[PDB]
């Protein structure tokens, strides 16, 4: 069998040396991932997605993304262990986790644990392939201190769960293969077969790129089944069919059941209507309950008395008979008009009647539509809401919000009383306004400002320590968001809620529909991200991706590989192809340069990793969606294993005993324990490790985002199509 004599050898070193080196490289990996894990205290890159997909799990709302559910459910499970409710939505990059406390440190720490645990799995993979402890340490170090693997595995991303599942798959398959070489159908053989299947299931349940890991293990499993089918293996067709049926069950059927199990959990957790509904059929949507917000949601009509609540501060739009001071503390002149403030407690001064514009044919009981002109009458003071070209108390650029008498507001000031419930999305213009479910900006028509409030500073004693309400000129700002909370004057007929009757569906019908929608949407979705990259640029790490930027501090997170390291990896791959071509040419000439044991290393573990790297690299030339450096990330874990291995093989006594005789011929004498030139090999590995570590330290400001770089220091790191922020 492939590398049978090599893989059945005892370990080349005592276990204490392996335990020493695995501990050191795991501690380095831990230090690199947990360094300043609380910073940036902001949403980074695809944390905007996975974070949201998690929350929606905690709220039980149905969403739909192009990725299997397992990794998002693992993130959501950490939130659930922290007692997080899903209130924070991660809507944009740069949102403060301090405003809405999402357990972001716990999520980042979970990924940092998985990224750290990848390193000892990689180490133990080479240990089980009978490589030296220093070789195992070096290959694992190339992942422990790679800038791309570090950046990805400390943020709230799926790739930490993907990469550990790929590492576990490679390790479990190597363990299975050693059990297969020693004694097939042992209890240990079954454990490692099903552990390979379980790990393969987690790979494909995280991302569909996991098919490349199935292809790599599938190829190796087929090659070994081909050896077991050979007569010279004395395998009675019945014994061969027993191998085939057990591998089919362990590597295909069981992993497929576990893949379906995650969709069954996903549909059982997500039992309420949500943002995913638009992607599914009406028959699928009939399986979903109504959102708690939609149950209490009532259409807002003209002449309804409403309370309007701010989304970020929970404050109600409020007014009372007190007036703005004729001058603010900075000496600016106010209108001396009636105060409009943000009040956090429900009272009679939160009540606004929604009135149509003067001269409209719109009667009582007609629904208010989004982006229609309206007037708001304060019920307690009998005044119209007004905004004008007077500056607000705290913000000189924002407008003071006040109220005017009915006579003046029906006279010359009529334009200044016109508001609109402006939708957050232009697609939602002309939809019916509903309480609790429809967010809007309260937009002033004449001056083109949105009503806004804040809770970092409260009005002085003349404003009762209430929140300021002002006209923000940055209309698109997400902090300008309001909702109608209650309709106070709701008719008894409009109070009656009719619950939707949830209709059941065949899990398999539900799964087939969602799966078709997943593949159809993954194939579509056409855009041009200022960071898409083609497969030919990945092994060189020629371009990266901006993950986060802070303009005030001139700080940034940039996703890029350890160029020195990824380039060691490449140069290796080329040297190995050269060695294989040279071995094939020399053998075809009757010249047997390489010892049998060197060939078992080359055509066994090194060829297994080389083909596995090919499976994770070449298929991307045949795809056409948007492709970003993360995928060379999986393949880099595999090629780091390969590099360590090939270089150890090189620094070994590779010479055949007799250059005219093929040592592969049965009964030929060959050297069973080729000497490794440990001294020059260790010096070589230390030199490469020091260069990779130097690069990691030099790029560490861009991995962590924690240090501001001068423009000359930024420009000094533009190595290739690398565009960095703050180079000017």
């Amino acid at each position: 069998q492939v590398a049978e004599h090599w893989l059945l050898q005892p370990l080349p070193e005592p276990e204490s040396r392996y335990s020493f080196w695995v501990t050191i490289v795991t501690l380095l990996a831990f230090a690199a991932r947990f360094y300043k894990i609380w910073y940036p205290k902001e949403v980074v890159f695809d944390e905007v997605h996975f974070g949201k997909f998690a929350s929606y799990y905690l709220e039980r709302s149905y969403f739909f993304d192009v990725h299997p559910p397992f990794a998002k459910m693992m993130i959501a499970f950490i939130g659930w262990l922290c007692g997080y409710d899903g209130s924070f939505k991660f809507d944009e990059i740069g949102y403060s986790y301090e405003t809405h406390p999402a357990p972001y440190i716990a999520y980042r720490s979970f990924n940092a644990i998985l990224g750290t645990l990848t390193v000892p799995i990689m180490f133990n993979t080479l240990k089980e392939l009978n490589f030296r402890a220093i070789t195992c340490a070096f290959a694992s170090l190339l992942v422990a201190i790679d800038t791309a693997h570090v950046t990805e595995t400390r943020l709230i991303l799926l790739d930490a769960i993907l990469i550990i599942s790929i590492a576990a798959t490679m390790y479990c398959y190597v363990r299975f293969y050693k059990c297969q070489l020693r004694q097939p159908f042992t209890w240990s053989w079954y454990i490692w077969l099903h552990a390979t299947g379980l790990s393969l299931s987690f790979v494909i349940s995280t991302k569909y790129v996991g098919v490349m890991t199935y292809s790599a293990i599938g190829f190796a499993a087929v090659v070994n089944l081909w050896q077991l089918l050979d007569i010279k293996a004395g395998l009675s067709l019945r014994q061969f069919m027993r191998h085939f049926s057990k591998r089919l069950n362990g590597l295909v059927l069981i992993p497929f059941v576990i893949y379906l199990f995650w969709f069954w959990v996903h549909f059982t957790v997500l039992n309420t209507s949500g943002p995913g509904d638009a992607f599914m059929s009406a028959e699928f949507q009939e399986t979903l309950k109504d959102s708690p917000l939609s149950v209490d949601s009532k259409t807002v009509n003209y002449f309804d008395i409403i309370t309007i609540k701010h989304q970020d501060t929970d404050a109600f739009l409020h007014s009372h008979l007190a007036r703005y001071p004729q001058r603010y503390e900075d000496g600016r002149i106010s209108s001396a008009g009636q105060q409009v403030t943000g009040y956090t407690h429900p009272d009679f001064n939160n009540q606004w009647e929604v009135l149509p514009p003067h001269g409209s044919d719109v009667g009582k009981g007609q629904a208010v539509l989004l982006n229609q002109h309206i007037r708001l009458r304060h019920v307690a003071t009998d005044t119209y809401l007004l905004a004008h070209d007077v500056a607000s108390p705290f913000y000189p650029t924002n407008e003071e919000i006040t109220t005017v008498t009915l006579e003046e507001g029906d006279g010359e000031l009529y334009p200044e009383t016109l508001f609109a419930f402006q939708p957050l999305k232009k697609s939602d213009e002309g939809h019916v306004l509903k309480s609790k479910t429809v967010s809007f900006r309260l937009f002033h028509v004449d001056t083109s400002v949105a009503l806004w409030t804040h809770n970092d500073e409260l009005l002085p004693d003349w404003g009762f320590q209430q929140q300021e309400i002002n006209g923000n000129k940055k209309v698109i700002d997400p902090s300008n968001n309001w909702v109608v909370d209650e309709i106070v004057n709701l008719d008894e007929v409009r109070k009656v809620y009719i619950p939707k009757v949830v209709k059941p569906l065949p899990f398999l019908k539900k799964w087939i529909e969602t799966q078709k929608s997943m593949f159809e949407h993954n194939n579509k979705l056409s855009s041009e991200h200022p960071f898409a990259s083609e497969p030919y640029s990945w092994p060189g790490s020629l371009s990266g991706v901006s993950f986060w930027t802070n303009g005030d501090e001139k700080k940034q997170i940039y996703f890029i590989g350890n160029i020195i390291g990824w380039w060691f990896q490449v140069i290796s791959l080329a040297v190995f192809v050269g060695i294989i071509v040279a071995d094939l040419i020399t053998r075809h000439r009757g010249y047997y340069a390489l010892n049998k044991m060197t060939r078992e290393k080359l055509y066994g573990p090194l060829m297994f990793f080389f083909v596995s790297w090919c499976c994770h690299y070449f298929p991307f030339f045949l795809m056409a969606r948007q492709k970003f450096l993360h995928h060379y990330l999986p393949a880099h874990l595999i090629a780091c294993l390969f590099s360590g291995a090939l270089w150890e093989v090189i620094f070994s006594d590779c010479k055949s005993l007799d250059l005219e005789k093929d040592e592969d011929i049965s009964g030929a004498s060959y050297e069973r324990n080729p000497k490794v030139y440990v001294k020059p090999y260790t010096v070589f590995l230390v030199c490469v490790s020091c260069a990779v570590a130097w690069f990691f330290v030099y790029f560490s400001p861009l991995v962590y985002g924690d240090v501001s770089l001068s423009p000359s220091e930024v420009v000094s790191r533009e190595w290739f199509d690398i565009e960095l922020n703050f180079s000017k």
Partner: peptide, 16 residues
């Protein structure tokens, strides 16, 4: 407003 280089550091798309 200052042009600025690179891009706004965007996310990747999620269907519609």
């Amino acid at each position: 407003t200052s042009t600025n280089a690179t891009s706004s550091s965007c996310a990747t798309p999620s269907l519609k």
